Ligand binder design. Structure first.
Ligand SMILES: Cc1cc2nc3c(=O)[nH]c(=O)nc-3n(C[C@H](O)[C@H](O)[C@H](O)COP(=O)(O)OP(=O)(O)OC[C@H]3O[C@@H](n4cnc5c(N)ncnc54)[C@H](O)[C@@H]3O)c2cc1C
Length: 369
């Protein structure tokens, strides 16, 4: 029986663990934190990621308690500039805890061995994983799913193109306060852009009937807009129609202003070691495909490992097959981010929706645009 060691309990790590377990691997997943949990408030999932969930046997628990807006609307200075529904292309909004729990319950039901307070500090291409305590573990496959700053990746050494965003945002989960919002289309996803009187943007995303996912974006150089707890006055001023929700957001003393970095590597494999998720391809958040590609890649890895070839050969075949979809998505997302293309509306074109249209289960592209 083949054994796999997965470093990282994030969406990519859980996806890989479950996919491998389903194919008969003995699997152990290592999470450095003392508890299994996800940060980031909310998250968007598209057709490609929803298919992975179906392939993992975790779709049902995710759909129940999640939300699909009637439309994805964009505003520029409070003027609606577009409403797109992606020609039937499936998508869903949910809190990260909701998605994380579905994956963790599924992993537990399958018998995946989860170790907390277990931090991987090094990986050997020959099939060895070293923990922070010094303990060395041997396996037939090592999966590096430890996010940005990946110690597994850095212990082997990959050529890396790195970039860091000077500006960030505050992501929060607050009550819907739907009735207090009054007249409007408050079940819609609404990306509210503003450049005047100042640069402030809010991504409004309902997760279900009780929770609302908000993304408050302001320049790092803005002392008021980027502060946490949020500076209520400055947000209500440019988004008065959301005052009821903003009032609730101002009470979250745990809010944080997060920035991000992007990563592109020369390769994702080395011997029996495979890198997945952020550790391998963190990207700009514009297309909301970070977790989507991560899960597709983690799931595809388990597929290529079922061809009867050696793990080393399976890994390079995996990257050759699946990598182009991620590279292209990462690049386009990079362009959108830099040029603030989403502020124009109608930007979810066929090209931008390429990764979302991919169906990892049948390995073909669906929902034509
Ligand atoms: C502002 C913003 C908005 C985004 N919105 C979306 C969206 O709407 N939809 C979408 O699909 N994607 C989105 N993304 C991208 C998405 O967040 C990531 O791609 C994905 O969640 C990360 O996958 P991961 O599991 O590989 O990373 P992680 O998320 O961090 O995986 C690593 C986990 O392993 C643990 N760990 C770290 N080091 C070690 C170690 N050495 N040993 C053991 N364990 C370790 C950590 O506790 C960590 O939780 C967004 C990103 C940003 C910055």
């Amino acid at each position: 029986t083949r054994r796999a060691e997965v470093a990282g309990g994030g969406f990519a790590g859980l996806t890989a663990a479950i996919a491998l377990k389903q194919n008969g691997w003995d699997v152990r997943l290592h999470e450095k934190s003392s508890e299994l949990r996800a940060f980031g408030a909310g998250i968007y999932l598209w057709h490609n990621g929803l298919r992975v969930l179906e392939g993992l046997g975790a779709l049902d628990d995710v759909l129940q308690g999640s939300h699909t807006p009637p439309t994805y609307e964009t505003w520029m200075h409070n003027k609606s500039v577009s409403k797109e529904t992606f020609n039937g292309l499936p998508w869903r909004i949910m809190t990260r805890s909701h998605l994380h729990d579905a994956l963790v319950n599924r992993a537990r039901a399958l018998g995946v061995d989860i170790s907390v307070n277990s931090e991987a500090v090094a990986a050997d291409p020959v099939g060895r994983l070293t923990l922070q305590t010094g303990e060395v573990l041997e396996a037939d496959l090592i999966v590096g799913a430890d996010g940005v700053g990946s110690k597994v990746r850095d212990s082997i050494g990959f050529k890396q193109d790195r970039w860091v965003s000077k500006d960030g945002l505050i992501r929060l989960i607050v009550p819907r306060m739907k009735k207090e919002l009054g007249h409007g289309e408050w079940d819609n996803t609404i990306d509210m852009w503003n450049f005047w009187p100042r640069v402030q943007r809010i991504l409004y995303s309902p997760c279900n009937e009780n929770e609302l996912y908000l993304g408050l974006m302001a320049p790092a150089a803005d002392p008021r807009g980027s502060s946490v707890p949020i500076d209520l006055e400055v947000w209500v001023e440019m988004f008065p129609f959301l005052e009821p929700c903003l009032i609730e957001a101002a009470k979250l003393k745990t809010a944080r202003y997060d920035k991000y970095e992007t990563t592109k590597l020369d390769s994702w494999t080395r011997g029996k070691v495979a890198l997945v998720g952020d550790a391998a391809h963190a990207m700009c958040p514009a297309l909301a495909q970070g977790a989507g590609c991560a899960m597709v890649n983690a799931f595809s890895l388990s597929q290529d490992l079922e061809e009867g070839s050696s793990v080393e050969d399976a890994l390079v075949a995996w990257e050759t097959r699946i990598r182009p979809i991620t590279d292209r998505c990462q690049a386009l997302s990079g362009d959108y981010a830099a040029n603030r293309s989403l502020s124009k509306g109608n930007m979810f074109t066929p090209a931008a929706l390429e990764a979302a249209r991919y169906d990892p289960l049948r390995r073909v592209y669906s929902w034509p645009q």
